[PDB]
């Protein structure tokens, strides 16, 4: 228990300095400029922002997980999770085996746990997937630009074969969507905005010219309009993607072969990737927490200069009501940056082990496409991430390494504010 300040500042000399800076409005104003600039780096910039890279990384890991495993994942049946007798259902723009589609044509077995994925669950997964790929392909916006949209996300699936009822669309009046050329509007909420979808139905006969299934089919097109692309929006989709996979917990089976890296386990149930799925969920959650710091930073601009209220010298004990704002802003920035770092450390294979490590290095953080733009599904996407997972970790690191000064400024600003806040009680 120290009696006085000189004995206290003998030992901790940086504290003397920090007091001198707390009394000097030009020092204070410099700190507040820094907070301006470092804020711009976190939420206004993209490639140089750890926050941006961490969000992108969380999204990419969810997408990549499905790009790795979706082709091996067994799916089938009819509506409401029922088994089917001869129902083939095909989703376009999905990473199937040697294909840009996933066929779900497993008949007879009941969809469910350690079983086929229901078409209901696929649908739910696929929409999240289509939106994420579309956004990745268009490139994500800076964190603060949370009011933009994707003009158009469009995806189709097709149902064929006797008894297949997966393209029957009910609608809220209880009326069926007209199967030949029906077309109807739907809504849902995506971070607090109402998004319309134009859902439409087409029938194509067996004998139609170059219907290559020589089987008649119903095609469902879904056209979403003005889909929000904020972080908070795409994380929620990512969350839906991975939680869908995880709750449905379908059976899957990959054939390993000789040569390549080796899937462990080769077969089982998707939710058996507990370590992988946990981390992806944790990444998503931490990116949500990080993004929520954006508003705290915005609510507390630091661009108004601060002075000795009346042309007379600055008094730290009375002239510094701005300090609670400045403390909260800096703490928000620090928190973003930590969260950002936490996100990369959850998936970075340098700290992984075992089969989880062999998942990320052998599969997730690779791409067998032959480098195409993000969001691209090709006939070699399957069994590899193809979501720039390594490149994204590398950039998160590079962004963090290039934030060394900025991080020190934030700390300094925080202590200065803290110091003022203190003086400011009494």
């Amino acid at each position, epitope marked *: 228990n120290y009696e006085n300040l000189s004995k206290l500042l003998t030992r901790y000399s940086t504290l003397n300095t920090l007091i001198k800076l707390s009394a000097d409005p030009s020092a204070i104003n410099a700190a507040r400029e820094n907070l301006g600039a470092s804020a711009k780096n976190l939420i206004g910039d993209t490639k140089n922002s750890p926050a941006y890279q961490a969000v992108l990384l969380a999204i990419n890991a969810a997408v990549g997980f499905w790009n790795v495993l979706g082709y091996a994942t067994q799916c089938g049946g009819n509506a409401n999770g029922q088994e089917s007798t001869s129902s083939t259902t095909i989703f376009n723009n999905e990473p199937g085996y040697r294909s840009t589609s996933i066929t779900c044509s497993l008949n007879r077995y009941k969809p469910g746990y350690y079983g086929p994925m229901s078409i209901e669950n696929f649908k739910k997964l696929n929409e999240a997937y289509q939106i994420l790929q579309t956004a990745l392909n268009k490139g994500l916006p800076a964190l603060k630009e949370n009011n933009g949209t994707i003009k158009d996300v469009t995806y189709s699936y097709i149902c064929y074969g006797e008894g297949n009822n997966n393209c029957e669309i009910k609608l809220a009046d209880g009326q069926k969507l007209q199967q030949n050329g029906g077309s109807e509007t739907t809504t849902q909420t995506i971070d607090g905005k109402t998004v319309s979808t134009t859902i439409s139905s087409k029938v194509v006969d067996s004998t139609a010219a170059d219907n290559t299934y020589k089987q008649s089919y119903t095609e469902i097109t879904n056209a979403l309009k003005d889909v929000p692309d904020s972080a908070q929006a795409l994380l929620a989709q990512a969350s839906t993607l991975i939680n869908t996979i995880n709750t449905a917990c379908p059976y899957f089976s990959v054939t390993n072969k000789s040569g390549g890296p080796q899937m462990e386990p080769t077969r089982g149930k998707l939710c058996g990737f507990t370590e992988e799925i946990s981390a992806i969920q944790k990444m998503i959650t931490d990116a949500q927490e990080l993004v929520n710091q954006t508003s705290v930073i915005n609510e507390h601009e630091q661009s108004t200069p601060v002075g000795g209220n009346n042309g007379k010298p600055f008094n730290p004990f009375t002239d510094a009501s701005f300090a609670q704002g400045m403390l909260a802003n800096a703490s928000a920035q620090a928190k973003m940056l930590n969260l950002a770092h936490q996100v990369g450390q959850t998936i970075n294979p340098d700290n992984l082990t075992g089969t989880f490590k062999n998942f990320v290095t052998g599969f997730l953080a690779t791409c067998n496409n032959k480098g195409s733009p993000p969001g691209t599904v090709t006939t070699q996407t399957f069994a590899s991430g193809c979501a720039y997972v390594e490149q994204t970790i590398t950039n998160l690191n590079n962004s963090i*390494a290039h934030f060394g*000064t900025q991080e020190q400024q934030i*700390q300094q600003a925080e202590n200065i504010a803290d110091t003022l806040v203190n003086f400011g009680s009494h």
Partner: nanobody
Amino acid sequence: VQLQESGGGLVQPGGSLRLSCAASGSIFSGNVMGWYRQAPGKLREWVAAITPQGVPNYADSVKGRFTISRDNAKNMLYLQMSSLKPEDTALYYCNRLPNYRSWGQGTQVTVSS
């Protein structure tokens, strides 16, 4: 979570020094690491950083003079310091980026004619 710097001393200007930091693997592994210094009357200033892949970057005040490297097998971090001016006199500290909140003891570097 431990950070231990060594290697500093007193030198004439134009001198060089090799700073070392043993970091725990929790700190080091898979992390960007970096060097810092704290001169009399100033607050800690970031000096350099290096990614886990070995990409270095530096502060304008030391670019061209200092070199940062990491031995990924020994959880070790180094600062090769050349052409030392009196302005580089400071306690030097090592840490990951973003920082672990408990700093090591640091190592004193004093430059004078």
